[PDB]
Amino acid sequence: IFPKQYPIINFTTAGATVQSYTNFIRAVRGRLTTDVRHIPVLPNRVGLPINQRFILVELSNHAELSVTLALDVTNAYVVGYRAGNSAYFFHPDNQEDAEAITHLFTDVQNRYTFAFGGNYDRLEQLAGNLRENIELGNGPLEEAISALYYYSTGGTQLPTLARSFIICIQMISEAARFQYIEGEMRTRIRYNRRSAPDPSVITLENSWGRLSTAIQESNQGAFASPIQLQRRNGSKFSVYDVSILIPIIALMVY
Ligand SMILES: CCc1cccc(CC)c1-c1ccc(C(=O)O)s1
């Protein structure tokens, strides 16, 4: 088939720098937001044409293996990926999204849909580790790309695959959603170190939907009820209005 053509952003771990990773994340944001409350809001899923529903992230590593992740522009989340002659999809939430993803990678000979969604709860269970024990950085991403690639010929076990999804979703989707998490990956690249995310990152990730709702329903930025977030040391604090989150959250779900 001659599939529908979605925008494609490239990143390689070979020779990766703070700047090249920053350019990558900035490019992903720019193609995701094609509407600003106080912070850009991702396009409404309602009435969004199929030709504008997806973007593609092509990842390459030092071994010159390439995989292509497919991102939903309405929530910045990975719905599936292509490696060579195979395409793999998380289980869709509803019939409409199931139809939308039939338009991705349609020239691939083998299409596979998992029974599990791309959510952290199930991915962590499959990986056998929580996010707080899965290291992130250029090293983990290099390994994630290879693990994703070799799943198509059975060279990757499912826990490794699920761990590699958790790495990719955070270093791409969450970093695009939050300048704070983009900064977290920047720092790992600066020290050439790999480390798991701390509670401030993990709780920010868990709070994206609630933070988005609180901001968009706020009275001139003021929240109706406070949102609890975590500090780096695990202690909690309350967020009462959108202003403190401006340097933190870069994209909001509609
Ligand atoms: C400006 C600080 C801030 C604003 C909005 C949300 C959060 C939570 C991710 C944070 C913090 C980041 C680390 C903090 C700490 O370790 O004290 S607070």
For 208-238, the DSSP string reads: HHHHHHHHHT-BTTEEEEEEEEE-TTS-EEE
Amino acid (one-letter) located at 245 = L
Which CATH class for the 177-254 domain?
Answer: few secondary structures
Residue 112: count of CB within 10 angstroms of its CB: 12
Q: What is the rounded distance in angstroms from the CA atom of residue 80 to the CA atom of residue 72? A: 10
120 is in an annotated binding site: yes
Taking CA atoms, 37 is separated from 42, 47, 216, in Å, by 11, 20, 7
* Percentages (nearest 5) of helix, strand, coil residues in the chain: 40, 20, 35
138 is in an annotated binding site: yes
Q: What is the CATH number of domain 5-176?
A: 3.40.420.10
Output the CA 229–ligand 1 centroid distance in Å: 8
Is 120 a known active-site residue? Answer: yes
How many helical (H) and strand (E) elements, i.e. helices and strands, does the chain have? Answer: 9, 8
Q: What is the rounded distance in angstroms from the CA atom of residue 227 to the CA atom of residue 229? A: 6
Cβ(3)–Cβ(218) under 8 Å? no
Q: How far is CA 232 from the centre of its chain?
A: 21
What does the DSSP 8-state code read for residue 152?
G
Q: 60 - beta bridge partners?
A: 12, 66
Output the CA 1–ligand 1 centroid distance in Å: 48
Catalytic residue, candidates 6, 77, 81, 151: 77
Residues 6+ apart with CB under 8 A from 223: 214, 215, 239, 240, 241, 242
Residues 6+ apart with CB under 8 A from 180: 200, 201, 204, 247, 248, 249
Q: What are all long-range contacts of 181-185, with beta carbons under 8 Å and residues at least 24 apart?
A: 181/205, 182/22, 182/25, 182/250, 184/136, 185/21, 185/136, 185/137
- DSSP sequence for 78-122: EEEEEETTEEEEPPPSSHHHHHHHTTSSTT-SEEEE-SS-S-HHH
Is 132 a known active-site residue? Answer: no
Give one word for 115, left, alpha or beta, with left for phi > 0 and alpha for psi -120 to 50: alpha
Is 184 a known active-site residue? Answer: no
Q: 62: helix, coil or strand?
A: coil
Please tell me the experimental approach by which this structure was elucidated. Answer: X-ray
Sheet of 54-60, strand order: 8-12, 54-60, 66-72, 78-83, 86-89, 110-113
Residue 196: count of CB within 10 angstroms of its CB: 16
129 is in an annotated binding site: no
Give the mutation target among 179, 180, 242 for probing the ligand 1 site: most ligand atoms within 8 A of CB: 180
80 is in an annotated binding site: no
The CA angle 193-211-234, to the nearest 5 degrees, is: 45
Is 77 a known active-site residue? Answer: yes
The residue extents of the domains of the chain are: 5-176, 177-254
Cβ(136)–Cβ(167) under 8 Å? yes
The two beta strands, 86-89 and 236-241, are: unpaired
Closest to 136 (Cα-Cα) out of 180, 169, 88: 169
The protein residue with its alpha carbon nearest to ligand 1, atom 10, reads 231
Q: What is the rounded distance in angstroms from the CA atom of residue 198 to the CA atom of residue 133? A: 9
Interhelix angle 199-206/179-190, nearest 10 degrees: 150
Assigned token pair, 218: 């706020």
Q: What is the rounded distance in angstroms from the CA atom of residue 188 to the CA atom of residue 207? A: 23
Output the CA 244–ligand 1 centroid distance in Å: 9
Give me the resolution in angstroms, 1 decimal: 1.8
